[PDB]
Design a protein around this ligand. Sequence first.
Ligand SMILES: CN[C@@H]1[C@H](O[C@H]2[C@H](O[C@H]3[C@H](O)[C@@H](O)[C@H](NC(=N)N)[C@@H](O)[C@@H]3NC(=N)N)O[C@@H](C)[C@]2(O)C=O)O[C@@H](CO)[C@H](O)[C@H]1O
Ligand SMILES: [K+]
Ligand SMILES: [K+]
Ligand SMILES: [K+]
Ligand SMILES: [K+]
Ligand SMILES: [K+]
Ligand SMILES: [K+]
Ligand SMILES: [K+]
Ligand SMILES: [K+]
Ligand SMILES: [K+]
Ligand SMILES: [Mg+2]
Ligand SMILES: [Mg+2]
Ligand SMILES: [Mg+2]
Ligand SMILES: [Mg+2]
Ligand SMILES: [Mg+2]
Ligand SMILES: [Mg+2]
Ligand SMILES: [Mg+2]
Ligand SMILES: [Mg+2]
Ligand SMILES: [Mg+2]
Ligand SMILES: [Mg+2]
Ligand SMILES: [Mg+2]
Ligand SMILES: [Mg+2]
Ligand SMILES: [Mg+2]
Ligand SMILES: [Mg+2]
Ligand SMILES: [Mg+2]
Ligand SMILES: [Mg+2]
Ligand SMILES: [Mg+2]
Ligand SMILES: [Mg+2]
Ligand SMILES: [Mg+2]
Ligand SMILES: [Mg+2]
Ligand SMILES: [Mg+2]
Ligand SMILES: [Mg+2]
Ligand SMILES: [Mg+2]
Ligand SMILES: [Mg+2]
Ligand SMILES: [Mg+2]
Ligand SMILES: [Mg+2]
Ligand SMILES: [Mg+2]
Ligand SMILES: [Mg+2]
Ligand SMILES: [Mg+2]
Lengths: 129, 208, 172, 316, 132
Amino acid sequence: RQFSYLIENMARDCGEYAHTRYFRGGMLTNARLLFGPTVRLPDLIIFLHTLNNIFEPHVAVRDAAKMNIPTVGIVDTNCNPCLITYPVPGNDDSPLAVHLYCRLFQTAITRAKEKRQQVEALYRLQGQK
Amino acid sequence: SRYSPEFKDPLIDKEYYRKPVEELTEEEKYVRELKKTQLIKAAPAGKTSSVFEDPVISKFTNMMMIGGNKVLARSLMIQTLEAVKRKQFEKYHAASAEEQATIERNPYTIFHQALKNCEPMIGLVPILKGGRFYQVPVPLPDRRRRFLAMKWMITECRDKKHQRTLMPEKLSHKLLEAFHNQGPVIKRKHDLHKMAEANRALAHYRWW
Amino acid sequence: GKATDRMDAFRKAKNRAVHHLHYIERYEDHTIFHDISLRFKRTHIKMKKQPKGYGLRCHRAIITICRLIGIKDMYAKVSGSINMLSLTQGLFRGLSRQETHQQLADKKGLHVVEIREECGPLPIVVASPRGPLRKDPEPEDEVPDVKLDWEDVKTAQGMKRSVWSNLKRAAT
Amino acid sequence: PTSKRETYTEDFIKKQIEEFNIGKRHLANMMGEDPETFTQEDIDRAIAYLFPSGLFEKRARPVMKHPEQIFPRQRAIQWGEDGRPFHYLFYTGKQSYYSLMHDVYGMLLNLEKHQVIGSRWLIKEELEEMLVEKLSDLDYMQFIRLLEKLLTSQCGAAEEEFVQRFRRSVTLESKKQLIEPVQYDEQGMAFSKSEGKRKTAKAEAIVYKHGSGRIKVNGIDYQLYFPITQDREQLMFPFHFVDRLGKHDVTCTVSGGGRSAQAGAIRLAMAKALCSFVTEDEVEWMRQAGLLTTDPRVRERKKPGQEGARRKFTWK
Amino acid sequence: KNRAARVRVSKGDKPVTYEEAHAPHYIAHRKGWLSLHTGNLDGEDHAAERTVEDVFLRKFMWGTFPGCLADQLVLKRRGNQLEICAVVLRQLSPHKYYFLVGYSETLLSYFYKCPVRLHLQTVPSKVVYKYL
RNA sequence: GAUUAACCCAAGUCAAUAGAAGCCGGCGUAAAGAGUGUUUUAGAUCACCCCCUCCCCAAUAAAGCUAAAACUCACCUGAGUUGUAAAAAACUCCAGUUGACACAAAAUAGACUACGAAAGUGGCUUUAACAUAUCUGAACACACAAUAGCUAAGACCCAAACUGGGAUUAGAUACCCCACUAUGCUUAGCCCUAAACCUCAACAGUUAAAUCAACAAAACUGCUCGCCAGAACACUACGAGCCACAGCUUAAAACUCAAAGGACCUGGCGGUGCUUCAUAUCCCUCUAGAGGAGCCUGUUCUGUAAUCGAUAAACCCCGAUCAACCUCACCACCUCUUGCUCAGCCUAUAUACCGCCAUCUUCAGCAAACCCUGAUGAAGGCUACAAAGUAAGCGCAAGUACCCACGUAAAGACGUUAGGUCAAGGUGUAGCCCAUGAGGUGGCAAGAAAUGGGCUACAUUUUCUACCCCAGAAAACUACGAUAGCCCUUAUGAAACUUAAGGGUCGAAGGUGGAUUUAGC
Ligand SMILES: CN[C@@H]1[C@H](O[C@H]2[C@H](O[C@H]3[C@H](O)[C@@H](O)[C@H](NC(=N)N)[C@@H](O)[C@@H]3NC(=N)N)O[C@@H](C)[C@]2(O)C=O)O[C@@H](CO)[C@H](O)[C@H]1O
Ligand SMILES: [K+]
Ligand SMILES: [K+]
Ligand SMILES: [K+]
Ligand SMILES: [K+]
Ligand SMILES: [K+]
Ligand SMILES: [K+]
Ligand SMILES: [K+]
Ligand SMILES: [K+]
Ligand SMILES: [K+]
Ligand SMILES: [Mg+2]
Ligand SMILES: [Mg+2]
Ligand SMILES: [Mg+2]
Ligand SMILES: [Mg+2]
Ligand SMILES: [Mg+2]
Ligand SMILES: [Mg+2]
Ligand SMILES: [Mg+2]
Ligand SMILES: [Mg+2]
Ligand SMILES: [Mg+2]
Ligand SMILES: [Mg+2]
Ligand SMILES: [Mg+2]
Ligand SMILES: [Mg+2]
Ligand SMILES: [Mg+2]
Ligand SMILES: [Mg+2]
Ligand SMILES: [Mg+2]
Ligand SMILES: [Mg+2]
Ligand SMILES: [Mg+2]
Ligand SMILES: [Mg+2]
Ligand SMILES: [Mg+2]
Ligand SMILES: [Mg+2]
Ligand SMILES: [Mg+2]
Ligand SMILES: [Mg+2]
Ligand SMILES: [Mg+2]
Ligand SMILES: [Mg+2]
Ligand SMILES: [Mg+2]
Ligand SMILES: [Mg+2]
Ligand SMILES: [Mg+2]
Ligand SMILES: [Mg+2]
Ligand SMILES: [Mg+2]
């Protein structure tokens, strides 16, 4: 809850989605009913905290593996990295580290989005002439 | 009930409203403004704002009434008050000069005091212990003993031992005997007091 | 599938089985890569790799699943409790945890050579490691400390008398 | 599956907007009105004449309203052709509710950095209309807890506007008796007329401003009309409370009910008509004494399977 | 428990009509009446003879238009006249409908000595209110 | 079972019988680690290397000792003591204080976790003293083995099978009270058992892999000994052995069954626990009643030639908002036969049903379709500072009706009780068809008794009259009190001791109701 505000803002800043709230069972394994048949699930889930408030693995770790979604996670020394596809071992409690992760993931994502507009414009411009 | 919970009971007291704002305490002053917003029930027919209104003589009238005949229950009460009044005037003119200072002639003062001489202090309640009922002495509440005094007086008068005596003459005779701490209604209180003091060994069965 | 109507249980089970699919590896598209002998709870399933033309000589349920998987030739014996759910949940577990010849080569960095009586002494290379081939051979063992099965040893020594084995049956 | 939730798209509702406008011009030609100045109140009046329905439920009667007041508000498509949701909190399920909690929690942090009657909090059912999202009771309470927390802090001018949106208004009817207009008769005497009701009794009372305390019920002196003292006590009650006995002349006419129902009906009528000749403060005391309220206690009906209204037949 | 004029709940594949979806305690709150005459008004008479005509007319039309009645009849009386209003399916050919209109109107006019008129309103399929 | 068709084999078929296929699995709870330890013949590889809890806390045996309590005796005082949910019996050289005084039993420490092969061992001191430099190793050899019990001789505070007395109870060979014995103790012999169960063998080792049916005390490996193969018969019978003579150990079969069993799930139940409740409700508490009398009315018995149905809650002035004939289905007698009906049936089955209801409901559930968990078992599915649930629809709710927002009606799902009704009507199945159908005449439906509900009363807050609430009379064997009985008249009707009303005569019980019980904010 301490970093819920920070993550939601960064998600908005980087044109991405966030879910720092209570995970209703079925968001992923039952999205058709909850959202609709033509819904598109995430292609990548970034776990900044792999544990819930009762110090147990977040349900989305297993629910993303059932839906074959690749997961990124910041695992601490009391976390399970077995179903996390790309795990980064680091502190997930101090606010000086969570600000770094957010700043790094927000920067890497914004760069790629701007990197494709340069590759497309060149291709489109080159294609015309 | 056809009234909603919002409706509050009315206050017939006529000297309460007249109270000057200067006497009103901060808590009381607040209450008065609050009542304005509240909805008030319509005052019932039984109680008015008269100076002769007595809540104990109205409750005693309601406990004798049968089938909603309040004109007859009230009639018996006033005849009884007049019988107590006329019997004391007859005991006052025939008394000595120094005996007239100890003769009460107000029938109300006699009615309220006679009922206070019949109020029991402790009663017997059946408690189930060990698959048996024990009449253990229990302290009667203030209301209970005020109610029993009225019920016993009406039961004694209703009791069919007096072959052809009108209620006003019976109720008036019992009220004058209880005023002097005499009669069966007082004796009935002692019999309940003698059984609560003999069975005080079972005063631990109760919990409350 | 669980429901009050039998026709409603078929849909749930049928539609939910396509979201819990396994991929079974097959040797030459007709049989398993090696002999499997696992135990699920109290059910024992001992499968064996067989040549083409042997057919399916296994429990009737195994014959239904194998046709679905695509395994033409295989022998299986079920022991212990013949619970359908433990036989089904145990079969897919052993058929998905089987090591192929390519993995075996990569794991040990050696050639997997197939020797057949019909082809005599000719060595057939079925798999080779993509990485550095090991220059040292596996240390030969005079006697291997491998737990054997009395049922198989008793059959090879001509001692398993049964009036129900190798009985003439229909094509499966 | 045969049962499908009736979903209305924007194109369907757009065609319904054109049929109402054309139907609105037809209904004005039937009634002979001007189409331009034909409001919705006239449509409700014309449809109630042309299609008279006596159904007690008003939602089951013919209605010709605008499609925006009939069809419910529907959650619009929440993603583009590509499939990316517009909002960044789509996967929460309650993107509207959580976007509001995110905004309110963001204004409470700024306050730390630089550092009423007639209104009620938006009800749960009214908060699901602003967000078009189903909300639990507990989530609504959480939102109210943040707004109250916002108010306690030294909120800026902008924040007050934000909170005001969620504060609905309640019109409270002042609990004040309605004074009757003092009239004057041919002779010039001032009086006030009012009406009362008790059980099945109805009474009309005329209270003259100046009098010698004479009351005439149906043209008969009250003591003759009411022999029982209790009934006379009820008549006195209003005047005794305002300590003005023997100062007005009353002429009432009660009809219906019984002995005790007629007095109560007169008491209430006199009391209401005596409020015009007393100060405002005295009228509030009468109200707090139960002299201006109509007793709603009336006989209860008997039920087919019971001996009485509430009494039951003996259980064998 | 009460059973009268109530369609019990089902899985959801049963389609019911507005009139069939409302129980007797809604007859004057959400429903009207299928027959409207003066027989049952205070001080009116011949309530038992207008009733027998309704019971027979509903059966005459049910057996004379078999499979064609989407909903119940709405019988209307204005003086001598009797107006039968019906909702019917479009499966039957129009030629056969006109035959049944002139046969039923005429037969019922000579049987009840009154001018009888029948007003059909065809519908493609049975209007469904909800699925119980 | 017959018939028809079909299936399999086929000059065979296939009923009875016999035989052929049986050891590398297990032993915490399913049948199995047999109470303990030692060794032998022998087997093993855990024996050399190579290593880490000697000693001390409640082992054992012998001798001696004694702090607290008790018994007994003595003095002084008192008149009772004991017993308990509450009593009785018992005792009264009894009880209380003080003092003297054990062959019995060993608070606290001990929240310790030790000794010993196990059994078992917890007051003090002293003596002797606690096997083994590989492991394993016995129903029977060798030696031990709680309690109970036998034999013999002692002791005796208390407890205490049996027994006797007292009480409870339908009974009480029991539970509760009292008293007392064998016995528990010592010495010397015997007996040789246990849920002797930490139900989990000894030694060595591992924590990786498929963790693992379930539960319990996680799962395995090596080695060895012992044991076990459906249940019951059977901790039996026979045999043998034994200081055992109603004994212990070892320990079958026949007859019989097609299951037994172990561990979970759900539901119900509980003279089940905690907590919180019941507002006309469980109990007490407020008010009027019931059961008491008479009458009315229903039912059950009985009766009659003479219906049916309902019949614990949820039947019982119920179907009937209704039986003199009719209604009517009943009984007796007579009559008719394609019959009011392109017949008919109040014939059986409500355990074939629709239909209309009761009931829990004075409830809050109900559920499609998905998802997840449990290793993909029956099953299950919440925590808001949130941990797998989402939910259309049905219901509640909301709306509506009545005098509003209140209250009362109405509504009230899915299910339950094979609940009610084939006699509302309809109807499936079986049955009757000169009769189980149809019609006519006459007729019964009572009351020894018991019971339910109701009416009226037992009076003085009453009775009668006038009035409709300022009255006058009455008032206990000519009072209160019958709507009953008897007689007459009238009303309806074709028909009335008969139904109802009224009048007259009559003037009973009854004097406030046992056990219990109903309704109402
Ligand atoms: C699956 N069958 C169960 C089994 O039924 C059995 C049941 O068998 C019974 C025997 O006849 C009887 O001689 C036998 N009686 C004896 N004295 N031995 C019963 O014990 C036996 N029942 C039983 N083991 N549960 O009765 C037999 C007639 C049965 O139906 C045979 O198949 O047992 C029944 C319960 O006894 C169950 O109800 C059945 O479901
Ligand atoms: K044990
Ligand atoms: K249970
Ligand atoms: K009584
Ligand atoms: K009685
Ligand atoms: K039924
Ligand atoms: K039938
Ligand atoms: K029927
Ligand atoms: K009665
Ligand atoms: K009388
Ligand atoms: Mg951490
Ligand atoms: Mg009443
Ligand atoms: Mg066992
Ligand atoms: Mg053992
Ligand atoms: Mg043993
Ligand atoms: Mg000790
Ligand atoms: Mg040994
Ligand atoms: Mg042996
Ligand atoms: Mg033994
Ligand atoms: Mg022994
Ligand atoms: Mg002994
Ligand atoms: Mg003793
Ligand atoms: Mg005895
Ligand atoms: Mg002894
Ligand atoms: Mg033991
Ligand atoms: Mg051993
Ligand atoms: Mg056996
Ligand atoms: Mg034994
Ligand atoms: Mg024996
Ligand atoms: Mg023997
Ligand atoms: Mg009967
Ligand atoms: Mg007859
Ligand atoms: Mg018949
Ligand atoms: Mg039934
Ligand atoms: Mg309401
Ligand atoms: Mg109701
Ligand atoms: Mg409702
Ligand atoms: Mg008399
Ligand atoms: Mg008479």
